[PDB]
Every structure is written in C-alpha cells, then in structure tokens.
Design a binder for these strands. Structure first.
Lengths: 82, 122, 218, 65, 216, 325
RNA sequence: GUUGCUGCAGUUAAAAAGCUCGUAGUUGGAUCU
RNA sequence: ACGGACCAGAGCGAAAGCAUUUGCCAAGAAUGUUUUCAUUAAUCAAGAACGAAAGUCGGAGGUUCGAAGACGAUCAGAUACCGUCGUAGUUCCGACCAUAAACGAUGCCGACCGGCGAUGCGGCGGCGUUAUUCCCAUGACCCGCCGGGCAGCUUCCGGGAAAC
C-alpha cells in the first residue's frame, strides 16, 4: 500500500461497508452507496447537505442492510430516539 | 386460413404506438394515412397493415391492450383516472378501532383523539 | 465507430471519467467492451489459453463447435478471463476476448520484505476456490519469478505480478476450473482487508451523482 | 427479390486433380442508386418515419399574416 | 425525523392512517420485520407501530430528495392496487414510473427497448415485485419498499412498515411519501395542508368506475 | 314487478303473476347461459326495457353506502334497485319508503358459524328432502309492484327501504336469512360470500356471520361467541422466497396478485355426466384421465381440488412420505 | 496433501465397529500480585 | 396362536427391540430444587455384558403357516412360476451360536453460527369455558413463557463432485 519512501503505491483505496467494516469489492455489484439528505431544523427543508452510507453486498443479501441503515441513521440524529 | 404475419402485426403495432392521433374506426381513413408516413411497399402489404389497425382500436374501446403502451388513453381514460370525489374517503365521522390499537395510540401521545369508537371483540 | 448505450458509457466517451479506477471504486458494472478498450488501449495483450473442440448434441446430430479460454492482461494492473463457445474458431476467440474485457479486475500488488521500489508480489497469501480446484498464491521475495503451473503462470504474468509461490490442490487438469480458480484468487487480493485499509473511507460522489447535469442533455 | 439482390457467379478454376466450382452470391444493400444498390427495398421491410412533433395548443391564437 | 417539531407526525395524519388501515398489518410475520411491530392481538393480526412507520417514511423521503435529477428515481408497482398511485406520485415528484409488467432485464440487458439506469428504486410490494429487486441487486440500486408484516427483506434498503395488502393503504402511503418529498424540497409549505386529495391515489377498480359513472 | 338476472337464471316463469314486468337491457345481455337465452328467445313477450333517472340512482347509492352493501353490489345491481324505486314512485306513494335505515342490533350466541342449520337435508334429534319438498326449497316464505332478486345484497337494501319484494315464489318475502362476512380487523362487512380478502384492509381475515332482515326494515347479526373462531393457530409460518417464472406457484396472499397462467387441459377438466342421452353408447363408464399433457406432469390442479389440505395449520406433521403439492 | 506432524479422508466414490460398560493411554473448568 | 382396529413422523428402551386387564418386583430419563459431595470427568487397546432373524444341542408343545419333500397341472427343450398336501422349524423352558442394508448407508463428548410454530414430557405465569351454572381446590380445554426430547417447514450462513 505505502512504500518505505512515502508514495501511495496502490491503484485505488476501496471503500469499506459502514455497517460491517468489510471491504466493498471491485465487482461487488450488490454494493450500495446511499445518500440520505439533511434538513433545516427550523424550516424542515432540504439543506443541500447529505450523510452517505455504504453497504456491502453480503449484508444486503441477508436482509440486515435495512436494520443497519436504520441504526446508522439513529447514530447520526437522522432517525430520532424511539 | 387468414392469419396475420409477423411483419404486418409489428407494423400495425408500431403505427398504433406512433400516430394514435391520426387513426380512426373507419378502415379507409387508416389507409391513406399509411402511405404518407411509413415507407411501405405497395398494396397487398399496404392493405394488410391498415386492416389490422382498424381491428386494434375497437379492442381499445374494450379497454386496454397487452401490446402497446403510449401515455395518452384518448380523452376519456385520462378523465376517468384523474377523478376525485367530493369528500375524501379518509375523512370519516366515526372510525372503529380495536382496544390494542387504542392502547398503542395512548402510548404515542394521541390519547386525546376524538373520532374513535373502541369496539370490543364480542 | 462507437456509440455508447449505458450512462457510464456516455461519461467514458467524453472526458468525464479519468481512469478505470473510478469505475472500480464505486463497483459499477462495465457492460460495454469499448470502455476497457478505451482506458487501457494498446496495453491490453491477450493469451489464448486453450481451444477445446466440443461436439454439441443436436436433433440434427453432431456438429463441431469450439470453446476458447482467453486471459486478457494489461501488465502491471488488470486481468480478465473469458470463455466462449462458437461455430468458427476465430469467432470463439473474439467473443472470448470481448467477454474477458468485461471481466477485467484490478489486482492489489504487495511487497515481500521491506517495501522498497515497486510492488511485485501478492500482498498476503490468498486463495481461489473454484469447483474442487483450490489455488493458493503466496508472497515470494523479489526476483523469484512465478513458480507455478503454466496456466496460472500466464494469468499471474498478465496481472503484472512478478513473483509468487503457487500451490494447487484437486483436479487441476480441467482447465476451466483452474484458470477460473486463479482468477478468483487474484480478484480476492483487493477484497482482503489488511492494516493498510483501516482509515474510515471518505465518500466521494459517484460518477452518476457528480455528472448528473451532463446526463440531462443525453 | 432473388433476381435483383443476389447475383450468382459460377466459374471453374482448374487445379491438378479435379475441378472446384465456386458460387459467390452477394446480396446487395439498399440506398437508391448513387451508383450503389437497387432503388426499391425489400417488399417485406417497412420503415416508419418519425413524426414531426406538432405544437400542443395553449390558447386560441389569431396571428394575422 | 431528526427529533424535529417540524417533521413530527400530526393528529390529522394519524387519523388518515387509521382510516386507511395502515396500522393493521398481516397475520403472518417475518422476524426481520418484528422490530417495526407494536403487538400481536389475540385475533391474530399484528398491529404496526405507527410512529415506527412515520420515521421510515421520512427517511425514504430524505433518500428520494437526495437525488438531483428527479427522473433518476424509478418507481415500480407490479400489482394493480398501486398502479394509479405510483403514476400520481411520478406526476407529482417528477419520478419515472414502471406500471404493470416489469420486463426482466429492464435494468441489466443494455440491448433492450426499455433499458434504463436509475439511481434509486422504489417498489410497492417486495413480495409481488421481487424481480426488480433482483435486478436492482445486479446494478447497484438502493431500494425503498413498502413492507408488510409479512415481507422478505432481501435487498430492501429503506423499508417502510405499513399495510400494503389494502387498496386505500397502498395509495395513502404513496400520497404521503409524495407530500413528504415535496415539503422536503420546498415546493409545498409545511404549515398549509396540501391541495391534492389523498383519495386521488386510491385504486379505481373497473366496476366501481361504472358505479361512479351513474351517480353524477 | 322488476326482474333481476336471477329470475331468468332460476327460470322463474312469473310472467303470469305480474303485469308491471320491467327490467334493464344490460342484465339480460350479461347472461352467458344458453338455456336461459333460449328461454329469452321464445317467451311470451310482455317484458319491457327501462332505464331510470339519475336522480333516483343517486338516491339509492346515497344510503346503500350507509347500510354497508354498496361495495358488494354491482353497477347493474344499482340499476335494478333504482328501477324499482322509481317504479314504486311512479304509481304508488313515495312517502312509504324511509331514508337512512335502522341501527343494527347485535345479538351474540355460542354457536359455531359452520353449524348446518338452514340446510334442508341436515337434521338433529322430521326434516327430510322428499319428491314433494323439492319445489318448496326456497327460503323464509310468508300488491302491484315487487322484485325478483335472488342476490341477498340486493334484498338487504330493498328491505331496508321498505320496498316490498319477493322471490321465485308467488308470495312476498318477509324475513331474509343469510350469511355475511365481517373483517375482524377493520369491521367492514361485505355481503359477497365468495371473496376471501376484505375490500377495505385487504387481509385474509373475513369471518362468516348470520344476518336476518325483516320486511319492517330491522337488521340483526348473530356474532359467534366461540373461541375456536378467533384463534391465532396456523397463522405465523415461515414462507418461501418469492419465486417468479412460468411454473412458480406463489402462496396467494393478496386478492390482486398476478399468477402465472396454469390451466388444466380439456381432456383433464371434463367431468363425466351419466344423464346424457348418448352416454350408454360410449365404451367406458367414465371419461378418461389425462396423463399425456404437460399440465398433468407439472401437477396443475383445480382450485376446488385440494381444499381441506389448505385449512390445516402449516406447522403440523404431515405423514412421513407425503409432500403437499 | 496418493501415508498426511505440519497436511488427507470415511451421505452417495474404498471406508464409522450392532450396542453399552470398561483396565491401560491420551486428554482434562475456573481460581492464588 | 395371536394381541387388530385405537396405533401418530406419538412414546420408551444402550441397541436388538417393546402394545389385552390387574397386581407385585426392581430400575430409568426429563423436569423442579438458595440440597449435598467438590473434579469425582471425556474418549477409550486388553477385557466384560446384552445383541433381530436363521441355525444348533437338551426337555416340553404342536393352531396357523411352512424351507425340505410328495403329488397335480404346464410344453420345440422345462427340471423356476401356479395349485393340493406337507417334514424340520415357526410356540415355551434351559443351554449354545454372535451375525443383518444391526441404516441417518452419516463415531463419541464439547463450543459456536439464522428463523418459524406444532407436537411429547416436566415446570412457571395467566383473563376465560367446562365437571347438569359445581360450594372451595382439583381435573379437561385456551393464551403465552422456560428446559430436555422425536420430528418438520423455511433461509444466497456457510459448505460441498454433487444430490443435498
């Protein structure tokens, strides 16, 4: 990845699943990069800013990707407590 | 007997798909409008493509087709579709609800709803 | 002359996507042969691994048709492997090549001892399991060369790996399973998590999400 | 269309052992003749000209011209 | 809902929901959906937590809004309950609708008539419209879907727990999602109740058409 | 004397009974039976087609949705109801008929809904079908205008109004005993006996409830106070992953899910009738089974065939060597 | 990695004793600066 | 002589196996336990119990059935098939014998890895209905929860030449 001198000798640094910290592969076509938008806390309107979630295919195959998404949202104050 | 061929049927479908404005029920109006648009060769395929097109719009007057799909539906289907009643079907006087549902509502902050009738499972 | 069909394709056509890496980063499927043929260009050579003739059981009797195994490789980066069956042999070959360009994967290249110079070997000992064929790649020191059976030797050479200790198990004789195993091993090099990729991945906008306004015009 | 699209040509090369006939039938394209191709297409092929999209009307507009 | 007073579910909405029957889920239950439930009653029917619904709906809206070309979002109903509703939604938001038969290889086969590339997929029923879920799985589409108490949660990203078996239930949900996307955009004001009637989204049904042709 | 489709369907030759024989042109063209159409082709023509005013149609539907029958009805059903109402209004006093019906009286018993009361052959502790009883088997039998409606949904609305109606019999009908289905989720009743999902919330939760309508206009329902009915037994059971294609039979969960067409061949779905005049000549007493066609080898089965097999709870134990299609 | 400690197998391919007890052998829960 | 129907993907037994009533005899699992002991255990060459059917000695007994065998039919060539009869045996007691597709064709003990509700046993918590409305507890149902069972359905967990 990074040689002794200090160069970044790697073709690309792959994104990791936010839900399981597993590496999303090059040919992981069930992989998701979802953007979920943020609002004005007075107006209740789209800001222009969003928080992004990655899911790998393996989670998404098992149906846990929904729950994971939910819990990430919770973590970010996009889905409230309760 | 007399069964229509793949090319003719396909041509008829294409014409219906692109030109439902210009056709009709009357056969011979379908026939002079096919020489104007499509580069067809002559009569006996110019007359078997205009003749499966008159057949295929009476069936539109039986409703839908399973062969074409053009956002139009003349000027009647649209009318029937964008219909709305006078008062919404969700604006109801008294809504019948289970005890469990009521309980749920109570544990949601909605204890002060007024339209509910908690009918008991008799 | 090329006229693209997919959204990705259109982007490629222009100068909106700079490298092949931006496709691999977002794990998008390359559905068109030209995209690969555009980015890697003349650097992609190919080796016909095998032409096995098969006779297809038809109601017309038996006719001859050929199965081609082709491993396309741009050296120092990207491999792919294709399998096609056709009436002519040339047809089979070109079909396989096209098919193998759609299957181009990047390989991660590592270091054996201290990380001095350019990477040469498989980053950690990986495996590729494909239907009773079990291929194992092992990091070898610089200049050892690929110590393997001829087929994964080819495949690893065209991947741009300089040196790798190979070891195969099971019925390695059936070529399809062998080549496919080795390809599966080499793909898995990027899929393996080391300490190198522990930093939380900051998300760039996807090719679609970035050039949305340019895709309105098409 | 077998009379004005395919063009048969039968010759005899004379190699040592016997004869080898050849039969090269080349079906010609369309695009009426700018030196190339028959004028009239296949009597099976039908092409449908894309409609020149007319104005969806807004207002009864009188513009005196 | 990000713990805001502006997005929080109001009294009218709850009454609409109840009228529809969105709370009354199915009899069967997949364990993946059990998170979103309130409780099973002795009758047999699982009652969907309505506050759970609302948050999910909001999330879905926030996903939909996060897309720049509104015609990227492909919206699919395969069964008839949602046909009108989906179309209405499309009209409102600016989404691309797939009504009726979803041809297999709409998303994969690039040498098709109706090959299309969405950035997002929204589906009425993860049971009935399984095929476009699978297609989405091949081509990288995050998926919003209206999930009943009984529904496999394969490949569904943001799942909205609600009755979708009912006719009013399907359409009301769609209406509400539309409303939320538009409010979120700023093309409707949140304070004033929306001009469009939720009844417009409901399934028409061929013989109820003739019952309403007569009485006019 | 307004005739419904059922009058011709049951061959109620009451053309001798009335003189006010009027009907809709639609209901007579909707009949797909050949013998009834043959009867239409010959019969002493004193019948006369009529279509009523939109004012009356609007008035029938106004409280048809209040009595809770309008969803169960048809468009042509409303046409007949409106025809009768405007016909009674034309000749006789309109003031007789009430608008907005009565509050229904709930009266529960401990009987199971499936109890074979009101079934002519079945008897408890004498109730016999005889060659004299056969013509008498109708319903609960007790001046100028009436109906010939065999549909209960029709009868319900008609008798809520106070429109004096009758059946295939000569005399007026007083009490109307039938069953209706109540959804135990949303409590929206349908008179449609055939359906299995409710029109409202769409679940498979409809349960049979007996109703009676007097000629006075009073409705009462007998609810079942029996725990066996509202029992959550074979309800939660794990379901297969949704399979599509040409053969995949999904487990049937909504009223409007698109099934792949799997019909039985015409060799298969031919039942043998022994009463045909030319039956005796044909070689074998029974019409041959199909074994040759694809429908047989795919095991395509009739909707009625395999019925009780569905009623067993899926978390049970089938015999060790059977698999349930 | 066709003798396998590293490193094989034992559903259908060669293979798990009919079953249980049991002497030797091997192997044995935490827990103390 | 045999214990049907009840007789189940129900139970019990180490397995082979095990079904008419009642009584006696000694065991046994599971469960419940703020009981005791405190590593006493897991698997196990030698060795030792039991081990279907058949067979073998000794006694008793022979209902049915029945290898053997005898007749009867059946034909270019019939000597297996089929019929009638019928010996040993099949039955019990006491010895032997020790094998079966003795089958889950799947060592034993232990840990982990998805889900679902039916059942059997025991236990815990429950509104009710039933013993002609029982007078209190107790039985029979019903809703749950717990542990060990014999099973099942479902799942792109992962495996696998694969069916699974």
């Amino acid at each position: 990845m990074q040689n002794d001198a200090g160069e970044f000798v790697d073709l690309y640094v792959p994104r990791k699943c936010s839900a399981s910290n597993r590496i999303i592969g090059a040919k992981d076509h069930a992989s998701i990069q979802m953007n979920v938008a943020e609002v004005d806390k007075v107006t209740g309107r789209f800001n222009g800013q969003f928080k992004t979630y990655a899911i790998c295919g393996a989670i998404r195959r098992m149906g846990e990707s929904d729950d994971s998404i939910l819990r990430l949202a919770k973590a970010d104050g996009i889905v409230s407590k309760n | 007997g007399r069964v229509r061929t793949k090319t003719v049927k396909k041509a008829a479908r294409v014409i219906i798909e692109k030109y439902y404005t210009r056709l009709g029920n009357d056969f011979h109006t379908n026939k002079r409008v096919c020489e104007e648009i499509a580069i067809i060769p002559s009569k006996k395929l110019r007359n078997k493509i205009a003749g499966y097109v008159t057949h295929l719009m009476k069936r539109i007057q039986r409703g839908p087709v399973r062969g074409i799909s053009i956002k139009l539906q003349e000027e009647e289907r649209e009318r029937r579709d964008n219909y709305v009643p006078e008062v919404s079907a969700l604006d109801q006087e008294i809504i019948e609800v289970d005890p469990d549902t009521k309980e749920m509502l109570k544990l949601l902050d909605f204890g002060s709803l007024s339209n509910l009738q908690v009918t008991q499972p008799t | 002359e090329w006229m693209p069909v997919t959204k990705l394709g259109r982007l490629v056509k222009d100068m909106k996507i700079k490298s092949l890496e931006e496709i691999y980063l977002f794990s998008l499927p390359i559905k068109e042969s030209e995209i690969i043929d555009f980015f890697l260009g003349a650097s992609l050579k190919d080796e016909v691994l095998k032409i096995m003739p098969v006779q297809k059981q038809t109601r017309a009797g038996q006719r001859t048709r050929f199965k081609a195994f082709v491993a396309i490789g741009d050296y120092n980066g990207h491999v792919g492997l294709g399998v096609k069956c056709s009436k002519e042999v040339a047809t089979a070959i070109r079909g396989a090549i096209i098919l193998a360009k759609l299957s181009i994967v990047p390989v991660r290249r590592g270091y054996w001892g201290n990380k001095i110079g350019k990477p040469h070997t498989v980053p950690c000992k990986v495996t590729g399991r494909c239907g009773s064929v079990l291929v194992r790649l092992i990091p070898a020191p610089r200049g050892t060369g690929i110590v393997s059976a001829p087929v994964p030797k080819k495949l690893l050479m065209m991947a741009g790996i300089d040196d790798c200790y190979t070891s195969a198990r099971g019925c390695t004789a059936t070529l399809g399973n062998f080549a496919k195993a080795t390809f599966d091993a080499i793909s898995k090099t990027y899929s393996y998590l080391t300490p190198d990729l522990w930093k939380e991945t900051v998300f760039t906008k996807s090719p679609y999400q970035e050039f949305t306004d340019h895709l309105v015009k098409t | 269309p077998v009379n004005y699209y395919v063009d048969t040509a039968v010759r005899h090369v004379l190699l040592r052992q016997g004869v080898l006939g050849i039969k090269v039938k080349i079906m010609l394209p369309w695009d009426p003749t700018g030196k190339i191709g028959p004028k009239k297409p296949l009597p099976d092929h039908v092409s449908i000209v894309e409609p020149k999209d007319e104005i969806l009307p807004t207002t009864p507009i009188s513009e005196q011209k | 809902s990000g713990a805001l007073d502006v997005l929080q579910m109001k009294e009218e909405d709850v009454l609409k929901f109840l009228a529809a029957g969105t709370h009354l889920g199915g009899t069967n239950l997949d364990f993946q959906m059990e998170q979103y439930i309130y409780k099973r009653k002795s009758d047999g029917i699982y009652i969907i937590n309505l506050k759970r619904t609302w948050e999910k709906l909001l999330l879905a809206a926030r996903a939909i809004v996060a897309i720049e070309n509104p015609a990227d979002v492909s919206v699919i109903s395969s069964r008839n309950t949602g046909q009108r509703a989906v179309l209405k939604f499309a009209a409102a938001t600016g989404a691309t609708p797939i009504a009726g038969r979803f041809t297999p290889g709409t998303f994969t086969n690039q040498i098709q008539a109706a090959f299309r590339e969405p950035r997002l997929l929204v589906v009425t029923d993860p049971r009935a419209d399984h095929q476009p879920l699978t297609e989405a799985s091949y081509v990288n589409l995050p998926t919003i879907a209206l999930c009943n108490t009984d529904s496999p949660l394969r490949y569904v990203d943001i799942a909205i727990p609600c009755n979708n078996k009912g006719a009013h239930s399907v359409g009301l949900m769609w209406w509400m999602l539309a409303r939320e996307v538009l409010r979120m955009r700023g093309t409707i004001s949140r304070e004033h109740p929306w001009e469009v009637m939720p009844d417009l989204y409901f399934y028409r049904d061929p013989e109820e058409i003739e019952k309403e042709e007569q009485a006019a | 004397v307004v005739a419904d489709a059922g009058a011709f369907l049951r061959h109620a030759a009451l053309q001798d009974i009335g003189k006010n024989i009027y009907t809709i042109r639609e209901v007579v063209t909707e009949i797909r039976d050949k013998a009834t159409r043959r009867r239409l082709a010959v019969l002493p023509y004193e019948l006369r087609f009529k279509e009523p005013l939109p004012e009356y149609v609007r008035l029938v539907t106004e409280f048809s949705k209040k009595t809770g029958d309008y969803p169960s009805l048809s468009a042509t059903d409303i046409q007949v109801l409106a025809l009768t109402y405007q016909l009674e209004a034309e000749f006789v006093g309109v003031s007789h008929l009430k608008q907005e019906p009565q509050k229904v009286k709930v009266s529960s018993s401990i009987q199971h809904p499936e109890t074979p009361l009101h079934i002519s052959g079945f008897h408890l502790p004498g109730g016999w079908i005889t060659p004299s009883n056969i013509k008498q088997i109708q319903q609960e039998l007790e001046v100028r205008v009436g109906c010939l409606t065999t549909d209960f949904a029709m009868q319900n609305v008609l008798l809520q109004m106070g429109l004096h109606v009758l059946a295939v019999n000569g005399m007026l009908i007083r009490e109307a005993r039938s069953y209706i289905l109540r959804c135990h989720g949303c409590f929206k009743t349908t008179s449609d006996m055939s359906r299995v999902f409710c029109s409202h919330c769409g679940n498979k939760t409809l349960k049979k409830v007996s109703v009676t309508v007097s000629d006075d206009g009073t409705l009462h329902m007998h609810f079942s106070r029996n725990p066996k009915v509202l029992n959550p037994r074979g309800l939660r059971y794990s379901l297969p992953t949704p399979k599509g294609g040409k053969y995949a039979i999904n487990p049937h969960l909504t009223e409007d899910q698109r099934f792949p067409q799997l019909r039985l061949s015409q060799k298969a779905r031919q039942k043998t009738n022994v009463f045909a005049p030319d039956y005796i000549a044909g070689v074998s007493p029974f019409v041959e089974n199909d074994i040759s066609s694809r429908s047989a080898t795919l095991q395509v089965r009739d909707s009625t065939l395999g019925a009780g097999r569905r009623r067993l709870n899926p978390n049970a134990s089938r015999k060790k060597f059977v698999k349930k299609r």
